[PDB]
Amino acid sequence: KTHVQLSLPVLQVRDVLVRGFGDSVEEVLSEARQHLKDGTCGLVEVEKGVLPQLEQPYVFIKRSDAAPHGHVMVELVAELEGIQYGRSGETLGVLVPHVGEIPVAYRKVLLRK
């Protein structure tokens, strides 16, 4: 399928144990997609002071359309030193590995895979 319904655990930035997916734009997008498929991907909602507490490159989910079955359609955009790889809509948050942190919420998304 070109899209997959996922419910992403929303993590507080200060709980996050593994603060990014790797060391290159291509690796973080690769690892993000693998973790999304494996159900091992969390979401941190972006506010003042969040991103400097996480590791670059960043992987964002961004709204790709204006929401089947409650699931917002999203796609991945990476960012490294102020350059984004991909073009999409509003940021829903930054993806991180999930290693058992307790979430505050779930974000239902339809991921363009």
mmCIF file of N, CA and C in Angstrom:
data_model
loop_
_atom_site.group_PDB
_atom_site.id
_atom_site.type_symbol
_atom_site.label_atom_id
_atom_site.label_comp_id
_atom_site.label_asym_id
_atom_site.label_seq_id
_atom_site.Cartn_x
_atom_site.Cartn_y
_atom_site.Cartn_z
ATOM 1 N N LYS A 1 0.858 -1.232 0.000
ATOM 2 C CA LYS A 1 0.000 0.000 0.000
ATOM 3 C C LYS A 1 0.874 1.256 0.000
ATOM 4 N N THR A 2 0.467 2.286 -0.737
ATOM 5 C CA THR A 2 1.154 3.602 -0.779
ATOM 6 C C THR A 2 0.968 4.363 0.539
ATOM 7 N N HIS A 3 -0.062 4.027 1.320
ATOM 8 C CA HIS A 3 -0.304 4.675 2.633
ATOM 9 C C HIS A 3 -0.575 3.616 3.693
ATOM 10 N N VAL A 4 -0.164 3.908 4.926
ATOM 11 C CA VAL A 4 -0.323 2.983 6.079
ATOM 12 C C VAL A 4 -0.857 3.809 7.248
ATOM 13 N N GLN A 5 -1.975 3.357 7.816
ATOM 14 C CA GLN A 5 -2.589 3.948 9.028
ATOM 15 C C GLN A 5 -1.692 3.605 10.212
ATOM 16 N N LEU A 6 -1.221 4.625 10.916
ATOM 17 C CA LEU A 6 -0.382 4.447 12.122
ATOM 18 C C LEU A 6 -0.935 5.332 13.221
ATOM 19 N N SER A 7 -0.791 4.866 14.463
ATOM 20 C CA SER A 7 -1.057 5.638 15.700
ATOM 21 C C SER A 7 0.291 5.826 16.395
ATOM 22 N N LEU A 8 0.821 7.054 16.375
ATOM 23 C CA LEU A 8 2.194 7.353 16.840
ATOM 24 C C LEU A 8 2.116 7.810 18.282
ATOM 25 N N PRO A 9 2.900 7.195 19.189
ATOM 26 C CA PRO A 9 2.950 7.650 20.573
ATOM 27 C C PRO A 9 3.631 9.023 20.633
ATOM 28 N N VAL A 10 2.974 9.969 21.281
ATOM 29 C CA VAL A 10 3.492 11.346 21.417
ATOM 30 C C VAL A 10 4.315 11.371 22.715
ATOM 31 N N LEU A 11 5.596 11.698 22.622
ATOM 32 C CA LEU A 11 6.542 11.678 23.762
ATOM 33 C C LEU A 11 6.877 13.121 24.165
ATOM 34 N N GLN A 12 7.068 13.354 25.463
ATOM 35 C CA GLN A 12 7.675 14.607 25.983
ATOM 36 C C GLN A 12 9.169 14.586 25.637
ATOM 37 N N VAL A 13 9.697 15.692 25.105
ATOM 38 C CA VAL A 13 11.118 15.792 24.662
ATOM 39 C C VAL A 13 12.067 15.360 25.784
ATOM 40 N N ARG A 14 11.790 15.715 27.038
ATOM 41 C CA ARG A 14 12.708 15.366 28.161
ATOM 42 C C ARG A 14 12.672 13.873 28.512
ATOM 43 N N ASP A 15 11.701 13.093 28.030
ATOM 44 C CA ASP A 15 11.634 11.623 28.276
ATOM 45 C C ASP A 15 12.446 10.882 27.223
ATOM 46 N N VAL A 16 12.658 11.508 26.080
ATOM 47 C CA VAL A 16 13.219 10.788 24.925
ATOM 48 C C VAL A 16 14.644 10.306 25.219
ATOM 49 N N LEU A 17 14.877 9.008 25.059
ATOM 50 C CA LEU A 17 16.189 8.384 25.349
ATOM 51 C C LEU A 17 17.082 8.397 24.118
ATOM 52 N N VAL A 18 16.519 8.259 22.920
ATOM 53 C CA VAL A 18 17.330 8.199 21.680
ATOM 54 C C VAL A 18 16.827 9.339 20.811
ATOM 55 N N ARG A 19 17.651 10.373 20.697
ATOM 56 C CA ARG A 19 17.165 11.732 20.361
ATOM 57 C C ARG A 19 17.274 11.979 18.851
ATOM 58 N N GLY A 20 17.566 10.954 18.064
ATOM 59 C CA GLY A 20 17.424 11.033 16.598
ATOM 60 C C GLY A 20 17.687 9.693 15.983
ATOM 61 N N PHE A 21 17.682 9.635 14.661
ATOM 62 C CA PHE A 21 17.716 8.381 13.889
ATOM 63 C C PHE A 21 19.105 8.114 13.297
ATOM 64 N N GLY A 22 20.023 9.063 13.339
ATOM 65 C CA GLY A 22 21.351 8.857 12.744
ATOM 66 C C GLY A 22 21.974 10.152 12.286
ATOM 67 N N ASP A 23 22.898 10.039 11.350
ATOM 68 C CA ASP A 23 23.975 11.039 11.179
ATOM 69 C C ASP A 23 23.929 11.687 9.799
ATOM 70 N N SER A 24 23.069 11.220 8.895
ATOM 71 C CA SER A 24 22.913 11.781 7.531
ATOM 72 C C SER A 24 21.425 11.922 7.233
ATOM 73 N N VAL A 25 21.063 12.841 6.340
ATOM 74 C CA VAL A 25 19.646 13.036 5.914
ATOM 75 C C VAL A 25 19.135 11.690 5.416
ATOM 76 N N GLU A 26 19.936 10.989 4.613
ATOM 77 C CA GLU A 26 19.452 9.741 3.987
ATOM 78 C C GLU A 26 19.250 8.668 5.074
ATOM 79 N N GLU A 27 20.151 8.598 6.058
ATOM 80 C CA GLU A 27 20.044 7.590 7.148
ATOM 81 C C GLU A 27 18.819 7.882 8.023
ATOM 82 N N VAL A 28 18.583 9.131 8.393
ATOM 83 C CA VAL A 28 17.483 9.449 9.340
ATOM 84 C C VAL A 28 16.146 9.145 8.669
ATOM 85 N N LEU A 29 15.994 9.462 7.376
ATOM 86 C CA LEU A 29 14.758 9.162 6.616
ATOM 87 C C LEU A 29 14.601 7.648 6.489
ATOM 88 N N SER A 30 15.699 6.936 6.212
ATOM 89 C CA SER A 30 15.721 5.447 6.145
ATOM 90 C C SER A 30 15.248 4.853 7.470
ATOM 91 N N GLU A 31 15.920 5.254 8.550
ATOM 92 C CA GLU A 31 15.683 4.701 9.912
ATOM 93 C C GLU A 31 14.264 5.063 10.349
ATOM 94 N N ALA A 32 13.819 6.294 10.077
ATOM 95 C CA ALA A 32 12.458 6.754 10.438
ATOM 96 C C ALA A 32 11.429 5.818 9.791
ATOM 97 N N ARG A 33 11.598 5.541 8.499
ATOM 98 C CA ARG A 33 10.663 4.683 7.733
ATOM 99 C C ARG A 33 10.689 3.270 8.317
ATOM 100 N N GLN A 34 11.870 2.757 8.652
ATOM 101 C CA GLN A 34 11.975 1.399 9.240
ATOM 102 C C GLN A 34 11.212 1.361 10.582
ATOM 103 N N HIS A 35 11.420 2.344 11.456
ATOM 104 C CA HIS A 35 10.799 2.418 12.819
ATOM 105 C C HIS A 35 9.279 2.586 12.694
ATOM 106 N N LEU A 36 8.835 3.400 11.744
ATOM 107 C CA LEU A 36 7.390 3.568 11.451
ATOM 108 C C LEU A 36 6.790 2.212 11.058
ATOM 109 N N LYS A 37 7.418 1.482 10.141
ATOM 110 C CA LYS A 37 6.971 0.130 9.715
ATOM 111 C C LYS A 37 6.957 -0.809 10.934
ATOM 112 N N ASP A 38 7.979 -0.773 11.810
ATOM 113 C CA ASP A 38 8.196 -1.726 12.940
ATOM 114 C C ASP A 38 7.409 -1.328 14.204
ATOM 115 N N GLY A 39 6.689 -0.209 14.174
ATOM 116 C CA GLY A 39 5.904 0.301 15.314
ATOM 117 C C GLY A 39 6.784 0.771 16.462
ATOM 118 N N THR A 40 7.999 1.212 16.157
ATOM 119 C CA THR A 40 9.022 1.632 17.149
ATOM 120 C C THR A 40 9.370 3.108 16.916
ATOM 121 N N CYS A 41 8.395 3.927 16.538
ATOM 122 C CA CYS A 41 8.625 5.353 16.201
ATOM 123 C C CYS A 41 7.714 6.202 17.065
ATOM 124 N N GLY A 42 8.292 7.205 17.735
ATOM 125 C CA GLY A 42 7.509 8.178 18.502
ATOM 126 C C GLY A 42 7.512 9.530 17.823
ATOM 127 N N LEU A 43 6.679 10.430 18.325
ATOM 128 C CA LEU A 43 6.476 11.789 17.782
ATOM 129 C C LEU A 43 6.641 12.773 18.924
ATOM 130 N N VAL A 44 7.452 13.801 18.718
ATOM 131 C CA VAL A 44 7.583 14.935 19.670
ATOM 132 C C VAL A 44 7.004 16.166 18.990
ATOM 133 N N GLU A 45 6.055 16.805 19.650
ATOM 134 C CA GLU A 45 5.392 18.026 19.145
ATOM 135 C C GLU A 45 6.372 19.172 19.316
ATOM 136 N N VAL A 46 6.492 19.985 18.272
ATOM 137 C CA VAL A 46 7.562 21.009 18.169
ATOM 138 C C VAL A 46 7.012 22.273 18.818
ATOM 139 N N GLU A 47 7.697 22.741 19.858
ATOM 140 C CA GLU A 47 7.481 24.062 20.490
ATOM 141 C C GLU A 47 8.853 24.678 20.771
ATOM 142 N N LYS A 48 8.836 25.935 21.203
ATOM 143 C CA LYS A 48 10.023 26.689 21.666
ATOM 144 C C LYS A 48 10.866 25.741 22.513
ATOM 145 N N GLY A 49 12.104 25.506 22.100
ATOM 146 C CA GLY A 49 13.132 24.834 22.912
ATOM 147 C C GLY A 49 13.187 23.340 22.680
ATOM 148 N N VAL A 50 12.249 22.775 21.917
ATOM 149 C CA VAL A 50 12.241 21.302 21.651
ATOM 150 C C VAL A 50 13.402 20.926 20.742
ATOM 151 N N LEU A 51 13.515 21.532 19.557
ATOM 152 C CA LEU A 51 14.479 21.026 18.552
ATOM 153 C C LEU A 51 15.915 21.068 19.064
ATOM 154 N N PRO A 52 16.366 22.105 19.809
ATOM 155 C CA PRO A 52 17.748 22.123 20.283
ATOM 156 C C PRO A 52 18.045 20.988 21.277
ATOM 157 N N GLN A 53 17.009 20.356 21.826
ATOM 158 C CA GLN A 53 17.132 19.202 22.752
ATOM 159 C C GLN A 53 17.168 17.887 21.972
ATOM 160 N N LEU A 54 16.964 17.924 20.653
ATOM 161 C CA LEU A 54 17.037 16.699 19.816
ATOM 162 C C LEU A 54 18.247 16.777 18.892
ATOM 163 N N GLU A 55 18.593 15.654 18.277
ATOM 164 C CA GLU A 55 19.805 15.539 17.445
ATOM 165 C C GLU A 55 19.419 15.759 15.982
ATOM 166 N N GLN A 56 20.188 16.572 15.279
ATOM 167 C CA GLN A 56 20.121 16.667 13.795
ATOM 168 C C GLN A 56 20.903 15.539 13.139
ATOM 169 N N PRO A 57 20.586 15.145 11.888
ATOM 170 C CA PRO A 57 19.416 15.648 11.167
ATOM 171 C C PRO A 57 18.082 15.283 11.842
ATOM 172 N N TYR A 58 17.096 16.180 11.778
ATOM 173 C CA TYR A 58 15.693 15.960 12.215
ATOM 174 C C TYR A 58 14.889 15.271 11.110
ATOM 175 N N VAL A 59 13.934 14.433 11.515
ATOM 176 C CA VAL A 59 12.868 13.946 10.595
ATOM 177 C C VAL A 59 11.536 14.496 11.075
ATOM 178 N N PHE A 60 10.869 15.299 10.241
ATOM 179 C CA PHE A 60 9.513 15.823 10.527
ATOM 180 C C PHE A 60 8.481 14.945 9.831
ATOM 181 N N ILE A 61 7.294 14.845 10.426
ATOM 182 C CA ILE A 61 6.051 14.544 9.667
ATOM 183 C C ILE A 61 5.326 15.858 9.428
ATOM 184 N N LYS A 62 4.929 16.037 8.169
ATOM 185 C CA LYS A 62 4.267 17.240 7.647
ATOM 186 C C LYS A 62 2.979 16.817 6.931
ATOM 187 N N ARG A 63 1.930 17.594 7.123
ATOM 188 C CA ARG A 63 0.584 17.327 6.564
ATOM 189 C C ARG A 63 0.698 17.447 5.042
ATOM 190 N N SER A 64 0.277 16.420 4.308
ATOM 191 C CA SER A 64 0.510 16.292 2.851
ATOM 192 C C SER A 64 -0.785 16.599 2.101
ATOM 193 N N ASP A 65 -1.872 16.891 2.824
ATOM 194 C CA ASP A 65 -3.246 17.033 2.266
ATOM 195 C C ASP A 65 -4.192 17.551 3.364
ATOM 196 N N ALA A 66 -5.342 18.134 2.984
ATOM 197 C CA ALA A 66 -6.430 18.597 3.889
ATOM 198 C C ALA A 66 -7.670 17.704 3.724
ATOM 199 N N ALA A 67 -8.530 13.828 5.768
ATOM 200 C CA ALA A 67 -7.976 13.071 6.917
ATOM 201 C C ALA A 67 -8.745 11.764 7.082
ATOM 202 N N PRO A 68 -8.501 10.764 6.208
ATOM 203 C CA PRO A 68 -9.279 9.524 6.209
ATOM 204 C C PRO A 68 -9.328 8.815 7.571
ATOM 205 N N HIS A 69 -10.541 8.563 8.071
ATOM 206 C CA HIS A 69 -10.822 7.725 9.268
ATOM 207 C C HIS A 69 -10.215 8.349 10.535
ATOM 208 N N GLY A 70 -10.000 9.677 10.557
ATOM 209 C CA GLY A 70 -9.337 10.422 11.653
ATOM 210 C C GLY A 70 -7.829 10.586 11.442
ATOM 211 N N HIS A 71 -7.250 9.846 10.490
ATOM 212 C CA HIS A 71 -5.795 9.785 10.200
ATOM 213 C C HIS A 71 -5.402 10.893 9.222
ATOM 214 N N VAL A 72 -4.608 11.857 9.698
ATOM 215 C CA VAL A 72 -4.045 12.977 8.886
ATOM 216 C C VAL A 72 -3.006 12.390 7.934
ATOM 217 N N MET A 73 -3.074 12.738 6.650
ATOM 218 C CA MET A 73 -2.097 12.237 5.667
ATOM 219 C C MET A 73 -0.816 13.039 5.855
ATOM 220 N N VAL A 74 0.302 12.342 5.969
ATOM 221 C CA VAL A 74 1.595 12.988 6.294
ATOM 222 C C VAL A 74 2.648 12.410 5.368
ATOM 223 N N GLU A 75 3.735 13.153 5.228
ATOM 224 C CA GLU A 75 4.970 12.634 4.611
ATOM 225 C C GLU A 75 6.179 13.109 5.422
ATOM 226 N N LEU A 76 7.315 12.468 5.180
ATOM 227 C CA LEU A 76 8.597 12.724 5.888
ATOM 228 C C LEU A 76 9.367 13.819 5.157
ATOM 229 N N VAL A 77 9.855 14.800 5.913
ATOM 230 C CA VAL A 77 10.872 15.800 5.474
ATOM 231 C C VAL A 77 12.024 15.812 6.486
ATOM 232 N N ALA A 78 13.264 15.670 6.032
ATOM 233 C CA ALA A 78 14.450 15.761 6.910
ATOM 234 C C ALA A 78 14.973 17.194 6.879
ATOM 235 N N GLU A 79 15.684 17.571 7.938
ATOM 236 C CA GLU A 79 16.340 18.893 8.049
ATOM 237 C C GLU A 79 17.730 18.735 8.670
ATOM 238 N N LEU A 80 18.725 19.413 8.076
ATOM 239 C CA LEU A 80 20.136 19.427 8.547
ATOM 240 C C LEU A 80 20.698 20.824 8.282
ATOM 241 N N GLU A 81 21.148 21.491 9.349
ATOM 242 C CA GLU A 81 21.723 22.863 9.320
ATOM 243 C C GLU A 81 20.858 23.746 8.422
ATOM 244 N N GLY A 82 19.540 23.741 8.673
ATOM 245 C CA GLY A 82 18.589 24.722 8.118
ATOM 246 C C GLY A 82 18.158 24.408 6.698
ATOM 247 N N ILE A 83 18.591 23.283 6.133
ATOM 248 C CA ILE A 83 18.122 22.863 4.779
ATOM 249 C C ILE A 83 17.203 21.647 4.944
ATOM 250 N N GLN A 84 16.018 21.699 4.330
ATOM 251 C CA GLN A 84 14.999 20.617 4.339
ATOM 252 C C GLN A 84 15.074 19.839 3.024
ATOM 253 N N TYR A 85 14.927 18.526 3.127
ATOM 254 C CA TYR A 85 14.956 17.565 1.996
ATOM 255 C C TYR A 85 13.555 16.981 1.908
ATOM 256 N N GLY A 86 12.826 17.497 0.927
ATOM 257 C CA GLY A 86 11.377 17.358 0.849
ATOM 258 C C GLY A 86 10.690 18.690 1.023
ATOM 259 N N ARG A 87 9.448 18.708 0.594
ATOM 260 C CA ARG A 87 8.583 19.897 0.617
ATOM 261 C C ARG A 87 7.200 19.362 0.950
ATOM 262 N N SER A 88 6.537 19.912 1.953
ATOM 263 C CA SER A 88 5.215 19.411 2.404
ATOM 264 C C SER A 88 4.541 20.517 3.206
ATOM 265 N N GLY A 89 3.466 20.183 3.917
ATOM 266 C CA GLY A 89 2.662 21.165 4.668
ATOM 267 C C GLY A 89 3.177 21.363 6.080
ATOM 268 N N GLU A 90 2.257 21.670 6.978
ATOM 269 C CA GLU A 90 2.523 22.058 8.373
ATOM 270 C C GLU A 90 3.118 20.859 9.120
ATOM 271 N N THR A 91 4.109 21.119 9.960
ATOM 272 C CA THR A 91 4.756 20.111 10.833
ATOM 273 C C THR A 91 3.750 19.609 11.866
ATOM 274 N N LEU A 92 3.576 18.295 11.960
ATOM 275 C CA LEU A 92 2.791 17.662 13.052
ATOM 276 C C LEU A 92 3.726 17.314 14.213
ATOM 277 N N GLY A 93 5.019 17.164 13.929
ATOM 278 C CA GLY A 93 6.048 16.985 14.974
ATOM 279 C C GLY A 93 7.329 16.389 14.420
ATOM 280 N N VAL A 94 8.255 16.063 15.310
ATOM 281 C CA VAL A 94 9.564 15.497 14.927
ATOM 282 C C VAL A 94 9.562 14.035 15.368
ATOM 283 N N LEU A 95 10.025 13.151 14.492
ATOM 284 C CA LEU A 95 10.019 11.709 14.793
ATOM 285 C C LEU A 95 11.285 11.371 15.563
ATOM 286 N N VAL A 96 11.172 10.391 16.467
ATOM 287 C CA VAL A 96 12.319 9.866 17.243
ATOM 288 C C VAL A 96 12.072 8.371 17.396
ATOM 289 N N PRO A 97 13.120 7.583 17.628
ATOM 290 C CA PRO A 97 12.930 6.209 18.055
ATOM 291 C C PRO A 97 12.100 6.185 19.336
ATOM 292 N N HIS A 98 11.236 5.181 19.426
ATOM 293 C CA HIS A 98 10.482 4.829 20.646
ATOM 294 C C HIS A 98 11.103 3.586 21.257
ATOM 295 N N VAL A 99 11.577 3.699 22.488
ATOM 296 C CA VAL A 99 12.220 2.569 23.201
ATOM 297 C C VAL A 99 11.503 2.339 24.535
ATOM 298 N N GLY A 100 10.192 2.602 24.603
ATOM 299 C CA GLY A 100 9.366 2.263 25.781
ATOM 300 C C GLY A 100 9.010 3.450 26.655
ATOM 301 N N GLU A 101 9.353 4.669 26.257
ATOM 302 C CA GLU A 101 8.889 5.885 26.966
ATOM 303 C C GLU A 101 7.357 5.899 27.038
ATOM 304 N N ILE A 102 6.803 6.381 28.150
ATOM 305 C CA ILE A 102 5.328 6.522 28.287
ATOM 306 C C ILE A 102 4.862 7.753 27.521
ATOM 307 N N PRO A 103 3.923 7.590 26.559
ATOM 308 C CA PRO A 103 3.413 8.725 25.810
ATOM 309 C C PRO A 103 2.404 9.536 26.625
ATOM 310 N N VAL A 104 2.160 10.752 26.154
ATOM 311 C CA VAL A 104 1.108 11.655 26.704
ATOM 312 C C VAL A 104 -0.138 11.583 25.832
ATOM 313 N N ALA A 105 0.001 11.095 24.596
ATOM 314 C CA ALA A 105 -1.101 11.055 23.611
ATOM 315 C C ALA A 105 -0.678 10.177 22.444
ATOM 316 N N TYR A 106 -1.620 9.942 21.541
ATOM 317 C CA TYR A 106 -1.395 9.266 20.245
ATOM 318 C C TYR A 106 -1.853 10.190 19.137
ATOM 319 N N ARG A 107 -1.082 10.225 18.056
ATOM 320 C CA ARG A 107 -1.363 10.992 16.822
ATOM 321 C C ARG A 107 -1.630 9.977 15.712
ATOM 322 N N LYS A 108 -2.888 9.881 15.274
ATOM 323 C CA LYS A 108 -3.324 9.007 14.156
ATOM 324 C C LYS A 108 -2.872 9.665 12.858
ATOM 325 N N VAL A 109 -2.068 8.968 12.060
ATOM 326 C CA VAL A 109 -1.587 9.523 10.764
ATOM 327 C C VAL A 109 -1.783 8.468 9.685
ATOM 328 N N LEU A 110 -1.900 8.939 8.452
ATOM 329 C CA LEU A 110 -1.833 8.101 7.234
ATOM 330 C C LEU A 110 -0.513 8.449 6.552
ATOM 331 N N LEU A 111 0.469 7.553 6.642
ATOM 332 C CA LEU A 111 1.856 7.816 6.185
ATOM 333 C C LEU A 111 1.981 7.405 4.726
ATOM 334 N N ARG A 112 2.304 8.358 3.853
ATOM 335 C CA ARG A 112 2.763 8.066 2.472
ATOM 336 C C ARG A 112 4.067 7.266 2.583
ATOM 337 N N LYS A 113 3.999 5.967 2.266
ATOM 338 C CA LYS A 113 5.097 4.972 2.365
ATOM 339 C C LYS A 113 5.558 4.593 0.953
#
